[PDB]
Write a protein that binds this ligand. Structure first.
Ligand SMILES: *[C@H]1[C@H](F)[C@@H](O)[C@@H](O)[C@]2(CO)C[C@H]12
Length: 539
């Protein structure tokens, strides 16, 4: 009555799991420096590999199989591409040293080989890891083979710790597979998926760093005529990166800002970059030992605001206690919506006080933030590693920044452009209502001080509505007139459904997207991001 299963098909015959022929079973791999105990089990729509590892697994090879020609690949963080690429014509990108870790947490890979983080898909199969709690899970294409790895960053384990589980799903319906992968991720990490999604206003994509409190107050008054729940102050108010409770210019205190917003009937929101401290900040120069190091010196995590930005060492209790105090204080002031940006800084490789992986460090930081703000606060992640944030954040930015222009000829390289922001909202659609609520970035609906056309505004906004994503507007509200108000109202009527991108493996920016059971019934939108055209059907 033996009941173990083995793949029947010829492609699956290439599969090697921890050096073993792929079939159901329990297995052990003993190497010089580590030991893995693992199990392969048949699950609905595929297979699941799980287990435990001890020793020094380093860059642990999990799976090797033949590489498909056309693969949907995924960058580890918000801004980076999720796109279909030819596996064999890859050339190593030039990586800007100011933003190296946005490209990859293991840039040594990306400098030689095509990399995908967390999952990779081909038409009819999905390979995907269900978590990133200790190791960083990634795939590389190495001379025609697709290889799955768990990167432990030289950390040694005296006792067994769990592997990040790997699934291999198979069915002709690729969107279904991605949706089922994401359901498994959500269960593995106890994803937060709020039943209510906030609407709101954000200052960034009109004012940028030039926001003043005078302009903020003008918008706070006008916002009373818009369907906004949250009113969120973005980067501009703070004296420096890390000095979150010190304000600049005409801004009142951080506490005062919250109270003005709340007295005006909005849920107050605030932006921080909580794992980042700039070289000029009070907090860094007061606590130079609080940052990740390289040869005992502070390691640059990225360069922005025209200065070197360092990463907080989230293995340190002093650091976690400082974050806890900060976010507790914010909650006490009345903020209930927190946009937390540049989160990848917390996971940069480097020297930390405790010998834990960068992913373990990251998880401690974001969990600390979660505890501080409480259950009833909404956390929106941004510039963030995706799988390690599941279970912590409520909302997640899943694309590069939008901008007040389309970017018809702008390179797909994670820089701001509405075309690529929207592309990622489409290709990472399946995370929505499974990992978290997807944030496609703000709608820019003004009719002046913008390079966007009316058709572009419609296309972006209606797509986001069909996708049931977060809807946040970012404009000088004075400059939003009848067209912009109408687009918003119509977008909000498209929400509420269960969306699917039906041709997720598309190579030419033309997508067919359906959503069942919206507030407008069943809907379909077909979009072309290069021609900037759409066709929308509503029941
Ligand atoms: C991170 C966010 F992705 C973006 O929306 C905006 O908040 C800024 C402000 O510095 C770029 C950073």
């Amino acid at each position: 009555h033996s009941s173990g299963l083995v793949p029947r098909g010829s492609h699956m015959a290439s599969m090697e799991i921890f050096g073993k022929t792929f079939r159901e079973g329990r297995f052990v791999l003993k190497e010089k420096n580590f030991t893995v105990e693992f199990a392969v089990e048949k699950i609905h729509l595929g297979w699941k590999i799980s287990g435990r590892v001890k020793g020094s697994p380093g860059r642990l090879e999990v799976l090797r199989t033949k590489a498909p020609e056309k693969v949907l690949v995924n960058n580890w963080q918000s801004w980076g591409p999720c796109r279909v690429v030819d596996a064999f014509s890859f050339k190593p990108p030039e990586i800007d040293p100011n933003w190296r870790y946005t490209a990859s947490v293991v840039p040594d890979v990306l400098e030689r080989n095509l990399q995908s983080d967390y999952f990779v898909a081909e038409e009819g199969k999905v390979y995907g890891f269900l978590s990133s709690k200790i190791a960083h899970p990634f795939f590389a294409v190495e001379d025609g083979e697709l290889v799955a790895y768990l990167e432990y960053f030289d950390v040694e384990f005296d006792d067994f710790v769990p592997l990040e589980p790997l699934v291999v799903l198979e069915d002709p319906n690729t969107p279904l597979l991605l949706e089922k992968y994401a359901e498994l991720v959500g269960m593995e990490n106890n994803a937060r998926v709020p039943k209510h999604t906030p609407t709101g206003w954000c200052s960034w994509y009109h004012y940028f760093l030039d926001l003043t409190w005078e302009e903020t107050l003008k918008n706070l008054k006008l916002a009373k005529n818009f369907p906004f729940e949250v009113f969120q102050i973005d980067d501009a108010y703070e004296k420096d990166i890390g000095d979150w409770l010190v304000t600049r210019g005409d801004f009142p205190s951080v506490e005062e800002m919250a109270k003005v917003i709340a007295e005006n009937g909005f849920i107050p929101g605030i932006w921080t970059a909580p794992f980042s401290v700039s070289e000029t900040s009070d907090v860094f120069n007061e606590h130079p030992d609080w940052v990740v190091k390289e040869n005992g010196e502070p390691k640059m995590a990225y360069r922005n605001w025209n200065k070197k930005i360092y990463a907080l060492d989230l293995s340190k209790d002093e650091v976690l206690n400082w974050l806890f105090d900060l976010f507790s204080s914010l909650r006490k002031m009345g903020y209930r919506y927190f946009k937390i940006d540049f989160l990848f800084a917390g996971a940069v490789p480097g020297e930390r006080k405790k010998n834990i992986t960068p992913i373990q460090a990251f998880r401690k930081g974001i969990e600390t933030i979660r505890k501080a703000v409480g259950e009833d606060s909404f956390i929106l992640g941004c510039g963030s590693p995706l799988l390690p944030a599941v279970g912590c954040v409520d909302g997640m930015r899943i694309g590069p920044d939008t901008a007040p222009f389309w970017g018809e000829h702008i390179e797909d390289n994670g820089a701001p452009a509405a075309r690529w922001a929207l592309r990622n909202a489409i290709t990472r659609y399946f995370m929505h209502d499974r990992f978290w609520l997807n944030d496609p970035d703000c709608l820019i609906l003004r009719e002046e001080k913008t390079d966007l056309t009316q058709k572009e505004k419609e296309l972006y906004s209606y797509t986001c509505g069909v996708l049931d994503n977060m809807i946040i507007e970012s404009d000088d509200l004075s400059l939003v007139r009848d067209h912009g108000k109408k687009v918003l109202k119509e977008t909000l009527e498209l929400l509420g459904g269960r969306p699917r991108v039906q041709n997720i493996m598309s190579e030419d920016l033309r997508y067919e997207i359906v959503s069942s059971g919206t507030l407008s019934g069943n809907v379909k939108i077909v979009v072309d991001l290069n021609s900037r055209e759409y066709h929308l059907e509503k029941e």
